[PDB]
From Swiss-Prot, chain A:
Chain's gene name: NOP58
Domain of life: Eukaryota
Family: Belongs to the NOP5/NOP56 family.
Protein's UniProt name: Nucleolar protein 58
Functional description taken from the UniProt entry: Required for pre-18S rRNA processing. May bind microtubules.
Cellular location(s): Nucleus, Nucleolus
Lineage, broadest ranks: Eukaryota, Fungi, Dikarya, Ascomycota, Saccharomycotina
Listed transmembrane segments: none
The protein's assembly and partners: Interacts with SIK1/NOP56 and NOP1. Interacts with the trimethylguanosine synthase TGS1. Component of the ribosomal small subunit (SSU) processome composed of at least 40 protein subunits and snoRNA U3.
Originating organism: Saccharomyces cerevisiae (strain ATCC 204508 / S288c) (Baker's yeast)
Note: Present with 34700 molecules/cell in log phase SD medium.
Signal peptide boundaries: none
From Swiss-Prot, chain B:
Pfam families, sorted: Ribosomal_L7Ae (PF01248)
PANTHER family: RIBOSOMAL PROTEIN L7AE FAMILY MEMBER
Main localization, broad class: nucleus
Gene designation per UniProt: SNU13
GO CC terms, sorted: box C/D methylation guide snoRNP complex; nucleolus; nucleoplasm; nucleus; precatalytic spliceosome; small-subunit processome; spliceosomal complex; U4 snRNP
Protein name (record): 13 kDa ribonucleoprotein-associated protein
Subcellular location: Nucleus, Nucleolus
Gene3D superfamilies, per database record: 3.30.1330.30
Keywords for this protein: mRNA processing, mRNA splicing, Nucleus, Ribonucleoprotein, Ribosome biogenesis, RNA-binding, rRNA processing, Spliceosome
Annotated GO biological process: box C/D sno(s)RNA 3'-end processing; maturation of SSU-rRNA; maturation of SSU-rRNA from tricistronic rRNA transcript (SSU-rRNA, 5.8S rRNA, LSU-rRNA); mRNA splicing, via spliceosome; snoRNA guided rRNA 2'-O-methylation; spliceosomal complex assembly
Subunit structure and binding partners: Binds to the C'/D and B/C motifs in U3 snoRNA. Component of the U4/U6-U5 tri-snRNP complex composed of the U4, U6 and U5 snRNAs and at least PRP3, PRP4, PRP6, PRP8, PRP18, PRP31, PRP38, SNU13, SNU23, SNU66, SNU114, SPP381, SMB1, SMD1, SMD2, SMD3, SMX2, SMX3, LSM2, LSM3, LSM4, LSM5, LSM6, LSM7, LSM8, BRR2 and DIB1. Binds to the 5'-stem-loop of U4 snRNA. Component of the ribosomal small subunit (SSU) processome composed of at least 40 protein subunits and snoRNA U3.
Higher taxonomy: Eukaryota, Fungi, Dikarya, Ascomycota, Saccharomycotina
PROSITE patterns, per database record: RIBOSOMAL_L7AE
UniProtKB/Swiss-Prot annotation, chain C:
Annotated compartments: Nucleus, Nucleolus
Keywords: Isopeptide bond, Methylation, Methyltransferase, Nucleus, Ribonucleoprotein, Ribosome biogenesis, RNA-binding, rRNA processing, S-adenosyl-L-methionine, Transferase, Ubl conjugation
Cross-linked residues, Glycyl lysine isopeptide (Lys-Gly) (interchain with G-Cter in ubiquitin): 67
Primary role: S-adenosyl-L-methionine-dependent methyltransferase that has the ability to methylate both RNAs and proteins. Involved in pre-rRNA processing by catalyzing the site-specific 2'-hydroxyl methylation of ribose moieties in pre-ribosomal RNA. Site specificity is provided by a guide RNA that base pairs with the substrate. Methylation occurs at a characteristic distance from the sequence involved in base pairing with the guide RNA. Involved in the biogenesis of the 18S rRNA.
Entry EC number(s): 2.1.1.-
Record organism: Saccharomyces cerevisiae (strain ATCC 204508 / S288c) (Baker's yeast)
The protein, known as: rRNA 2'-O-methyltransferase fibrillarin
Effect the entry attributes to changing residue 136 to S: In nop1.3; thermosensitive allele showing a decrease in histone-glutamine N-methyltransferase activity upon shift to restrictive temperature
GO biological process entries: box C/D sno(s)RNA 3'-end processing; maturation of SSU-rRNA; regulation of transcription by RNA polymerase I; rRNA 2'-O-methylation; rRNA methylation; rRNA processing; snoRNA guided rRNA 2'-O-methylation
Record's signal peptide: none
From Swiss-Prot, chain D:
Domain Nop, first and last residues per copy: 292-370
Organism: Saccharomyces cerevisiae (strain ATCC 204508 / S288c)
Span within the parent record: 8 to 417 of 504
Annotated protein name in UniProt: Nucleolar protein 56
Subcellular location: Nucleus, Nucleolus
Keyword line: Nucleus, Phosphoprotein, Ribonucleoprotein, Ribosome biogenesis
Keyword Phosphoprotein: yes
UniProt modified residues of type Phosphoserine: 314
Entry's Gene Ontology molecular function annotations: mRNA binding; snoRNA binding
RNA sequence: GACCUUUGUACCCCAGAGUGA
């Protein structure tokens, strides 16, 4: 190619950690919200995805 | 349901109006729930007087919560017009605050009024 | 900012040093605020794998706004409230002390709050939704037999209720819900009992009728810097 | 005496038979022995509540000296003793007031409450776990916790104006969502800035640009006609579409394969998700802003209301507080302080107090000009 | 064997807890 493409790895691995930062950000936001209805869950199940 | 408790009887009301009259004579009086709330913040407030004919009444419900936090007595009076009149003042004052001074010339009247109010609060 | 924090002699209360003698406790609520208190963030984190960095905030505790911090700064020999115990708390005036007692009782310990004035109670229901160790039980204090099902047996009882007649109130709670050889701590405001007489005779008959209900007083004290005309009394049950 | 008392808790209604108490008197042997043993009492019968609705309704009844019917059914156990009322049984309980009620629905039964703090009743509750005969204990003290929540929450609270924190979560989550929108927007405009360096200099919108890169993926096919993409979101007679015809000819950018483009389709779908939830959550914030603080959204609208309660943390916490523009801002501060105290207390803020308050803001708004 | 600071750009142009005819 005209650029010898390798820069996109440098972009993507700069994006991945910020993706996990939004992930546990919005997961904890959901925990803060849903704790009103059902607080007794976070001590039992701690993973974001299963929450 | 009541929203007007405790509300004072007659001779206690005129007694309070006279104490507020000499208090306004001795600049030992605060005028306004803004100022009264500030005196409840500084802990200088002896007790709080609130009116019953204020429309709406719900602007004046913060003073019992803040007083009960600070353990401060309070009693409703029926007229805001007479409560303004006892300030030496010709337009109505909805709520007044009594400030703390042990060098006060009228201190025994203040302790007797606090005796009547703290008698009624229980 | 730049202060350092040590464990005090009492288990659960932490000292803060030193450009002012400051009294702090651990918050089990991250980043909450009860009365606009200022929090000091100090951590022992880890940059290694397997251990994430800790985030620890501590809360200061105004001795002007609570009677117990005023008790500790004034010097007091022992505190019956420690990590592990159960504690029955009376008086619920703003809930500001209930946060710090909930801090010092630990996640093991259970805080029991009693109020009859219904409008400040919703605040404590909200704090009960925030801290999972503050259990409100809202009722007149004078009839504790009316909630016989509603509380377990308790190591130590604190009473901060200003009455003309608190002696019968701690009589019923003490005869009913207290364990053997537990702790009884009573707050006294001077002019609430009487005002036509010296506070000191009120103290003498207070300790007297306190002693008539099988309670042994250890040492009382006057709080002259912080809250004028106010005293706290510490005693034992059936010693 | 003829004693056969009743232990009461959240923990099951239990009837226990007695052998005898100490008719001996208050010394420091009998009290200190009976503090910790506490045999001489055996567990006869029991029955669970086991309704979370049932227990609290029962608890108001025992809390007000009123019997329940399961209590009568569990006081239907004297049959192998051949009779009632030959017994002249004496009950001992914790309540004074429950006594005349039981004596009302039972003339068969003698019922006292002496002593009121009979230390045998302490002898049950100081040793209760060991008399969980068939009863669990794990969520049982948890039923103590939540049932105390049920009483104290029940008697004063009815979820009236709940949104003291939900609005704050809404505005905080909304703002971090907008910051996350600009995140992927920069990445998509960088990416299609490579393959086609002119549309990134043409469309200033983010979601518009994301759909444009999303459904085309080729810089020789992006026109209003052949194919049609500026006949669905935008109209072809706009000043943008003619420059799209202008730009689709004179491009000199890099030509990239599909495998690099599908990841960008993932990105545009992320932008679509973010725009979706921010618009719906914005609508929800309009709704509950109209609900929980009506007079405030009458005055200053939704946004500064949600921000200011997001500063104070609750309407109660905002309620307890207190160059020719700060006269207006001070006036708005006082009247918003009043309107907040209106909105704090129970459904008279459904009325138009804030509306004539805004009429007063219109009067002062007339007053600063003259 | 053993992230921290500077230059340039956009925004803000800075009464709240002040005082109390």
């Amino acid at each position: 190619s005209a650029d010898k493409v390798d820069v996109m790895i440098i972009q993507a691995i700069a994006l991945l950690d910020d993706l996990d930062k939004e992930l546990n950000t919005y997961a904890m936001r959901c925990k803060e919200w849903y704790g009103w209805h059902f607080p007794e869950l976070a001590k039992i199940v701690t993973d974001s995805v299963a929450y | 349901n009541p929203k007007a408790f405790p509300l004072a009887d007659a001779a206690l009301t005129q007694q309070i109006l006279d104490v507020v009259q000499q208090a306004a004579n001795l600049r030992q009086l605060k005028k306004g729930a803004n100022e009264a709330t500030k005196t409840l913040n500084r802990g200088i407030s002896e007790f709080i007087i609130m009116a019953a004919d204020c429309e709406p009444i719900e602007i004046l419900l913060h003073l019992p919560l803040l007083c009960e936090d600070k353990n401060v007595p309070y009693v409703f009076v029926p007229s805001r017009v007479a409560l303004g009149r006892a300030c030496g003042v010709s337009r109505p004052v909805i709520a007044a605050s009594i400030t703390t001074n042990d060098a006060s010339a009228i201190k025994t009247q203040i302790y007797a009024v606090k005796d009547k109010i703290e008698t009624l609060l229980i | 900012a730049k202060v350092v924090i040590e464990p005090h002699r009492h288990a659960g209360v932490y000292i803060a040093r030193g450009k002012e003698d400051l009294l702090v406790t651990k918050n089990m609520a991250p980043g909450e605020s009860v009365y606009g208190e200022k929090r000091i963030s100090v951590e022992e984190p880890s940059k290694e794998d397997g251990v994430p960095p800790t985030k620890v905030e501590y809360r200061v505790w105004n001795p002007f706004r609570s009677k117990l911090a005023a008790g500790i700064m004034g010097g007091l020999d022992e505190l019956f409230i420690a990590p592990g115990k159960k504690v029955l708390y009376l008086g619920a005036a703003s809930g500001t002390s209930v946060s710090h007692v909930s801090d010092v009782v630990g996640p093991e310990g259970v805080v029991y709050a009693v109020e009859f004035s219904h409008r400040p109670g919703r605040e404590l229901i909200s704090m009960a939704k925030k801290r999972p160790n503050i259990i409100p039980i809202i009722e007149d204090a004078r009839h504790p037999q009316k909630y016989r099902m509603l509380i377990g047996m308790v190591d130590c009882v604190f009473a901060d209720v200003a009455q003309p007649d608190q002696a019968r109130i701690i009589a019923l709670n003490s005869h009913m819900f207290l364990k053997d050889q537990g702790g009884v701590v009573i707050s006294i405001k001077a002019n609430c009992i009487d005002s036509t007489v010296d506070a000191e005779t009120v103290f003498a008959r207070e300790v007297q009728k306190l002693r008539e209900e099988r309670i042994k007083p250890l040492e009382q004290l006057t709080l002259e810097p912080y809250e004028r005309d106010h005293c706290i009394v510490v005693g034992r049950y059936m010693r | 005496l003829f004693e056969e008392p009743t232990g009461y808790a959240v923990f099951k209604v239990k009837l226990q038979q007695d052998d005898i108490g100490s008719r001996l008197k208050e010394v420091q042997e009998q009290i200190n022995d009976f503090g910790a043993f506490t045999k001489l009492i055996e567990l006869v019968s029991f029955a669970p509540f086991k309704g979370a609705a049932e227990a609290l309704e029962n608890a108001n009844d025992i809390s007000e000296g009123l019997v329940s019917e399961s209590l009568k059914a569990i006081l239907d156990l004297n049959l192998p003793k051949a009779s009632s009322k030959k017994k002249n049984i004496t009950l001992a309980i914790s309540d004074k007031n429950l006594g005349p009620s039981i004596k009302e629905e039972f003339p068969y039964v003698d019922c006292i409450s002496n002593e009121l703090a009979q230390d045998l009743i302490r002898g049950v509750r100081l040793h209760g776990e060991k008399l969980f005969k068939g009863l669990q204990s794990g969520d049982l003290e948890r039923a103590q916790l939540g049932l105390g929540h049920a009483y104290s929450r029940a008697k004063v609270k009815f979820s009236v104006q709940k949104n003291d924190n939900h609005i704050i979560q809404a505005i905080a989550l909304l703002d971090q969502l907008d910051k996350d929108i600009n995140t992927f927007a920069m990445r998509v405009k960088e990416w299609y800035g490579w393959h086609f360096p002119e549309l990134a200099k043409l469309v200033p919108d983010n979601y518009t640009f994301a759909k444009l890169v999303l459904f085309i993926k080729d810089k020789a096919s992006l026109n209003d006609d052949s194919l049609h993409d500026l006949a669905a979101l935008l109209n072809e007679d706009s000043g943008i579409a003619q420059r799209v015809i202008d730009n689709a000819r004179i491009s000199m950018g890099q030509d990239i394969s599909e495998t690099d483009m599908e990841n960008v389709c993932v990105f545009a779908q992320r932008v679509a998700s973010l725009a979706d939830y921010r618009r719906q959550l914005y609508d929800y914030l309009c709704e509950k802003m109209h609900t929980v603080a009506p007079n405030l959204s009458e005055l200053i609208g939704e946004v500064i209301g949600a921000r200011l309660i997001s500063h104070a943390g609750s309407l109660t916490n905002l309620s307890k507080q207190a160059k020719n523009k700060g006269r207006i801002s001070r006036y708005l501060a006082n009247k918003c302080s009043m309107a907040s105290r209106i909105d704090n207390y129970s459904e008279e803020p459904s009325n138009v107090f804030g509306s004539v308050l805004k009429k007063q803001v219109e009067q002062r708004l007339e007053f600063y000009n003259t």
